[PDB]
RNA sequence: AACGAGACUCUGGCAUGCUAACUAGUUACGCGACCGGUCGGCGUAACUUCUUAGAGGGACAAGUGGCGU
């Protein structure tokens, strides 16, 4: 299912041309799951991300 | 017994409250020069949520206004600033009427006479300028005034023979004979520069403080170092008190009000309960103001505001 | 107190998504009388989040080369669209704008990695500010592309897609691009 | 970025070192004294010397700094270095020697010393670090 | 457009100076906070002006198209 | 910059002179270089030991 | 230690503060004209906000808070 999220701390900006920010992502269900994700676009700390598959992992492309 | 308490702050400035002047003829208007180029007429409602409101800002200066003074009546003012000018004001409609040019450095302080006709001023030009009430200077001083700046100039409001006195940054309190422009007394006693001079209302005891932090006061009739008042950091300002017979001295972050003949520090005057922004410096206390009744004490601070002090007789 | 074009108020506008709440403007103090403000929103990063999104839609309306400076042209296009929207729906015409910006932006893009001619992409997330940036782009180019050689004016062609994006229809150009931008995104995943 | 070149820092260091009594924390009265002490070609350099001086005077309250040397600290360090305690740290009535130290003193005919209190020697010969 | 944004700035800056010169400072504050809260360009001038054209291109930043070989 | 005509052709001669300071009593420019900060050597403040009231 | 970098020079932005304006004006006063309004229509005076251009100010990472051996 779809899962709504939050941003704890932005880690670093990865990608082929530096287009992807890599971000440490908390959930909004009071969950202690601090997943790391690949977000494309401008991000600061304290965003509200919206994922479709909430079990994916951060790689470096 | 007699303590000093807070009732409120007069928050109307944007720069440092450089010097405060109060008048005994009006118990409602306070005049506080500032470092945001404006002098603000205050109005004292003395209620619970505003001890003072601003009434008429006086804007003529293109730099930091240093020293303001009110006349013997509550309708004329006088001020100077760091652009070498002096602006004679008008309290009724809130404008200027006369403008005193002739200085070549920053006008540091300006004193007002009791007869309201002798205007004196000290600048960074190592010179003292004596004026009319109109604008033509009468005599400019190069009688070896100081080797460096002239930080504060003050008249002597005595019923006796008057005198004019002016400290400086060369550790010296030089005494001058008015209308004859000659030295009277030197006082080689200070380590480091000076910041202010105040004169007691009788006209006998002058005080003078500076970088040494110690209010070394002198006598105007014979020249004795009477009392070595002690302080912590720099003395930004000094002022006397006619009724309670004290000496208001300025610490950096606090105020030291002193019994004079007893030499007891009676109160400490400060307000710091914060801790996350106390890693830096606490704000200095730049000026001091004593009103007519002496129940109120006004201080000029570095958080752009003026704090009131009440003498609770206990 | 503050009505857009003096007629449309903002108190009953309700943003649905929590993902776009801090980024999509006016509900409270970004209420302006007109979309023209002439303010320095591009002076820093993230500063254009604090600009009224009516001015965002106005600014992206003038994209093509023959209209590139014309702001007084596009503000009356938006003003005339906010009549046709209200006629064809019957409600406040700002709730449909945030319903269109919520619905139109994708939530999973693909980032391009390969060699000269070789394409092997990979699916990533979408920041909600890029969702707001790409919502208004798809809306405005749908209004632009379907009014070109057509008797329909730009005010009708903007309004008839600004409601069709709120209803989530697949006749609107905006939702037709979002579902394909996620369809080719899921195809790698 | 905003880095001050060797001109600003060299001039600021000499003008601290010679005129520390006049300089305080206000940048404005620092600028009014840095244009009366020094002859700077004008303002945009004058305000950069006076700003590093205003950042450098706050750095002197918190201790010394590794460049300049000013004689309010260098008298306090001088009075800190001429500090003797009342009774020295070498006047101990019970000083501890090994067994073998007492044998060296007996070679030096100092076995008649009374203050020495020989300790029990260590039972294990374990002093090398565990290599590997 | 540049004269509209100059008229509305001078209306605001005129009413504020009238309330400072012939009314009290408190009413000037209660005007100024609403004027600032709406848009700061009703009291503070916008200081951006046009850059200068440079040789090598059609304007300030843009350059002429170049070719190869 | 000047020219010479020799036997074989032309030479050029370029001569640059960096002039010195000393405000113009006949020589050099007046103002110093824009990075040359001079500092007035302080006569030391004499040490104030005891309060002497010199009435003159 | 020397050069290049930076400083420097011109320009933009601010000043109801200074200097002055019939080859720039605004405000006020009469007159005139048409309905207290409108005058880029006419002449006097208060003065420099607008216009000009000179000196001098103003911003320094200076203030607060985080991170930096």
Curated annotation (Swiss-Prot), chain A:
One of its GO terms (molecular function) is RNA binding. SUPFAM superfamilies: Nucleic acid-binding proteins (SSF50249). One of its GO terms (biological process) is rRNA processing. It comes from the Eukaryota. It is found in: Cytoplasm, Cytosol; Cytoplasm; Rough endoplasmic reticulum; Nucleus, Nucleolus. It is linked to Diamond-Blackfan anemia 15, with mandibulofacial dysostosis: A form of Diamond-Blackfan anemia, a congenital non-regenerative hypoplastic anemia that usually presents early in infancy. Diamond-Blackfan anemia is characterized by a moderate to severe macrocytic anemia, erythroblastopenia, and an increased risk of malignancy. 30 to 40% of Diamond-Blackfan anemia patients present with short stature and congenital anomalies, the most frequent being craniofacial (Pierre-Robin syndrome and cleft palate), thumb and urogenital anomalies. This is Small ribosomal subunit protein eS28. It comes from Homo sapiens (Human).
From Swiss-Prot, chain C:
The modification Phosphoserine is found at residue 127. GO terms for molecular function: mRNA binding; RNA binding; rRNA binding; structural constituent of ribosome. It is found in: Cytoplasm; Nucleus, Nucleolus. Keywords: Acetylation, Cytoplasm, Isopeptide bond, Nucleus, Phosphoprotein, Ribonucleoprotein, Ribosomal protein, Ubl conjugation. GO terms for cellular component: cytoplasm; cytosol; cytosolic ribosome; cytosolic small ribosomal subunit; extracellular exosome; focal adhesion; membrane; nucleolus. One of its GO terms (biological process) is translational initiation. Its main location: cytoplasm. There is a cross-link at residue 32 (Glycyl lysine isopeptide (Lys-Gly) (interchain with G-Cter in SUMO2)). It comes from the Eukaryota. It holds the Pfam family Ribosomal_S7. The keyword Protein biosynthesis does not apply. SUPFAM superfamilies: Ribosomal protein S7 (SSF47973). Signal peptide: none annotated. The modification N6-acetyllysine is found at residue 32. The keyword Signal does not apply. Belongs to the universal ribosomal protein uS7 family. Component of the small ribosomal subunit. Part of the small subunit (SSU) processome, composed of more than 70 proteins and the RNA chaperone small nucleolar RNA (snoRNA) U3. This is Small ribosomal subunit protein uS7. It comes from Homo sapiens.
UniProtKB/Swiss-Prot annotation, chain E:
GO terms for cellular component: cytoplasm; cytosol; cytosolic ribosome; cytosolic small ribosomal subunit; extracellular exosome; focal adhesion; membrane; nucleolus. GO terms for molecular function: RNA binding; structural constituent of ribosome. Its main location: cytoplasm. One of its GO terms (biological process) is maturation of SSU-rRNA from tricistronic rRNA transcript (SSU-rRNA, 5.8S rRNA, LSU-rRNA). It comes from the Eukaryota. The keyword Ribonucleoprotein applies. Coiled coil: none annotated. It is found in: Cytoplasm; Nucleus, Nucleolus. Keywords: Acetylation, Cytoplasm, Nucleus, Phosphoprotein, Ribonucleoprotein, Ribosomal protein. Belongs to the universal ribosomal protein uS9 family. Component of the small ribosomal subunit. Part of the small subunit (SSU) processome, composed of more than 70 proteins and the RNA chaperone small nucleolar RNA (snoRNA) U3. Component of the small ribosomal subunit. The ribosome is a large ribonucleoprotein complex responsible for the synthesis of proteins in the cell. Part of the small subunit (SSU) processome, first precursor of the small eukaryotic ribosomal subunit. During the assembly of the SSU processome in the nucleolus, many ribosome biogenesis factors, an RNA chaperone and ribosomal proteins associate with the nascent pre-rRNA and work in concert to generate RNA folding, modifications, rearrangements and cleavage as well as targeted degradation of pre-ribosomal RNA by the RNA exosome. This is Small ribosomal subunit protein uS9.
Curated annotation (Swiss-Prot), chain F:
Changing residue 38 to A: Reduced phosphorylation by IKKB. The modification Phosphothreonine is found at residues 49-50. Belongs to the universal ribosomal protein uS3 family. Methylation by PRMT1 is required for import into the nucleolus and for ribosome assembly. Sumoylation by SUMO1 enhances protein stability through increased resistance to proteolysis. Component of the 40S small ribosomal subunit. Identified in a IGF2BP1-dependent mRNP granule complex containing untranslated mRNAs. Interacts with HNRPD. Interacts with PRMT1; the interaction methylates RPS3. Interacts with SUMO1; the interaction sumoylates RPS3. Interacts with UBC9. Interacts with CDK1; the interaction phosphorylates RPS3. Interacts with PRKCD; the interaction phosphorylates RPS3. Interacts with PKB/AKT; the interaction phosphorylates RPS3. The gene is RPS3. It comes from Homo sapiens. This is Small ribosomal subunit protein uS3. It comes from the Eukaryota. It is found in: Cytoplasm; Nucleus; Nucleus, Nucleolus; Mitochondrion inner membrane. The modification Phosphoserine is found at residues 38, 53. Changing residue 50 to A: No effect on phosphorylation by MAPK. Significantly reduces phosphorylation by CDK1 and nuclear accumulation. Greatly reduced phosphorylation by PRKCD. Abolishes phosphorylation by PRKCD.
